[PDB]
């Protein structure tokens, strides 16, 4: 085919509010629309989000019809000044196709590893065209893939990095006509 080993590419980098009042609760909440390219956040604070203008990130935002398997990676880089006997943080991860409460969860992981953790898993896009799917289109009351998170003691489990990779069998077709992507500095 066309292949290279261990070459994944960046999508997400979500950082947690610094201003967080351990009083109006313990958790912080956020979501990543893997097939849409959008980070949705809390009102808990002033969140620092960034989506990376990656070959793929770039591609999934523009390509209107998607069939195949993409590979995801979420990494927790945390607050390392916190002494390991003093860790109080879990982070509940969810995989859904809507941001609706009435929809049900596809997969559900819960990780509580001090200072850092890794999570590698497959997502597959199956749709009504010929097996092709379009981002949350009204056509077959179409959907996406969403990766939502729930952080407990967000002052500890501070940073989140989302990477994905592509499958030899990802096929697109069409152009979702999108505005200009913003490039830092």
């Amino acid at each position: 085919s066309i292949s290279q080993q261990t070459v994944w590419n960046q999508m997400a980098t979500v950082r947690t509010p610094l201003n967080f009042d351990s009083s109006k609760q313990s958790f912080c909440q956020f979501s990543v629309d893997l097939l849409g390219g959008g980070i949705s956040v809390d009102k808990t604070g002033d969140w620092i989000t960034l989506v990376q203008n990656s070959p793929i990130s770039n591609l999934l935002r523009v390509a209107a019809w998607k069939k195949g398997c993409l590979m995801v990676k979420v990494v927790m880089s945390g607050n390392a000044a916190v002494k390991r006997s003093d860790w109080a943080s879990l982070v509940q991860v969810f995989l859904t196709n809507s941001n609706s409460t009435e929809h049900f969860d596809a997969c559900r992981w819960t990780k509580s590893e001090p200072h850092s953790w890794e999570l590698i898993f497959p997502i597959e896009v199956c749709g009504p065209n010929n097996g092709f799917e379009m981002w949350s289109s009204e056509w077959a009351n179409q959907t996406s893939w969403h990766l939502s998170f729930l952080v407990d003691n967000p002052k500890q489990s501070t940073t989140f990095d989302v990477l994905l990779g592509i499958s030899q069998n990802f096929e697109i077709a069409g152009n979702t006509l999108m505005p200009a992507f913003s490039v830092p500095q």
Binding site: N53, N58, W65, S182
Partner: protein, 374 residues
């Protein structure tokens, strides 16, 4: 004495067949105000809104028929004399997600065609809106976002006496819809890219008015503080290194009265603009016939030794590109008897007999691409 309703032919699920007349779905009239400047959105809407614009023979057939296994045919028409020229385009993309861009980079990847009415007095494009299969629906066109953008890329050369109107005739065709899908990791051949590679403008006079175009083509188009993007580029950039034969399409967008012989070749960026000696390089000299507006240019894979990088940082100094460039020059002069600037647009239609060694982690943003008035 009774009639059976059941054995009546009221349940026919078939694609409309007929004469070009019978299979007429709409008539859009588009307005070309004589003070048009170029980069102007003449009309940007939804296809379904373009097609629902008149009650013409298969019009209800468009609306009350669930599966149409035929193709949307456009026939455009506006005549402009030979001492002026406008450069219009019809860009059909598959969805719009927000306040989107209407450049030409961003709107020419799927199915779009540029035409100078002074030279081409009647264009006909045909497309298949479900690049994934063989049938479409109006409700599809409706609830999915099929877009049609009609833009001016290089404004009037001579300003006409009063306003103008382009009338587009819309129809359903006699020919089947054929998919065009993209495997991103196992490209096809010939790979369809369709990339605005630039709007080359050559002022009137004896200036070699040398235009260099990067052959690195991932990220896409540059914007002030942003990157512009179209799938056929999105994917290319998924790879790391590339080769193949690059097939370019040079279009005249100025008035058949503005003359120039343009010289195209392939080199590197280290050369000075006063390099007497280039034309001792494989080169091809282009000249346009009065009413001729399209020259197709093919550079063979034998004009490149080794595959090149798909991305190069935006600052990389014309002295540090190790990647091949596409140089355009004036071999004579730009001459006219009316104010005007010679403008020709270049679009990389297909990379044929491609080789992609790699996978690109990415490089932030990309560089700029030419544009300007008229």
């Amino acid at each position: 004495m009774e009639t059976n309703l059941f054995k009546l032919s009221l349940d026919d699920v078939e694609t409309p067949k007929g004469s070009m007349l019978d299979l007429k779905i709409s008539q859009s009239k588009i307005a070309l105000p004589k003070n048009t400047v170029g980069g102007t959105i003449l009309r940007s809407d939804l296809l379904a809104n373009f097609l629902t614009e008149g009650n013409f023979r298969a019009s209800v057939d468009l609306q009350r028929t669930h599966r149409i296994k035929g193709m949307i045919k456009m026939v455009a028409t506006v005549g402009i004399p030979e001492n002026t020229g406008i450069a219009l385009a019809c860009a059909m993309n598959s969805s719009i997600r927000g306040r989107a861009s209407s450049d030409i980079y961003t709107i020419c990847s799927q199915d779009c065609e540029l035409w100078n009415p002074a030279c081409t007095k009647a264009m006909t494009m045909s497309f298949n809106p479900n690049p994934c299969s063989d049938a479409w629906s109006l409700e599809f066109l409706k609830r999915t976002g099929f877009h049609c953008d009609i833009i001016c890329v290089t404004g009037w050369t001579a300003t006409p006496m009063q306003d103008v109107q382009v009338t587009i005739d819309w129809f359903i065709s006699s020919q089947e819809c054929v998919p065009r899908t993209y495997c991103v990791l196992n490209p096809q051949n010939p790979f369809v890219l369709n990339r605005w590679m630039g709007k080359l403008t050559f002022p009137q006079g004896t200036s070699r008015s040398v235009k260099r175009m990067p052959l690195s083509i991932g990220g896409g188009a540059g914007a002030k503080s942003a990157i512009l993007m179209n799938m056929p580029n999105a994917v290319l950039s998924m790879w790391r290194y590339f080769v193949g034969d690059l097939v370019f399409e040079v279009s005249k967008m100025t008035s058949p009265y503005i003359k120039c012989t343009v010289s195209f070749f392939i080199a590197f960026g280290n050369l000075a603009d006063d390099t007497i000696n280039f034309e001792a390089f494989p080169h091809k000299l282009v000249q346009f016939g009065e009413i001729q507006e399209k020259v197709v240019l093919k550079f063979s894979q034998e004009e490149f030794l080794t595959a090149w990088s798909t991305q190069v940082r935006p600052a990389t100094t014309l002295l540090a590109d190790g990647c091949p460039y596409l140089y355009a020059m004036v071999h004579d002069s730009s001459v006219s008897t009316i104010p005007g600037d010679f403008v020709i647009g270049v679009k990389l239609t297909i990379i044929e007999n491609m080789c992609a060694y790699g996978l690109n982690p990415g490089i932030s943003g990309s560089r700029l691409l030419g544009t300007i008035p008229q």
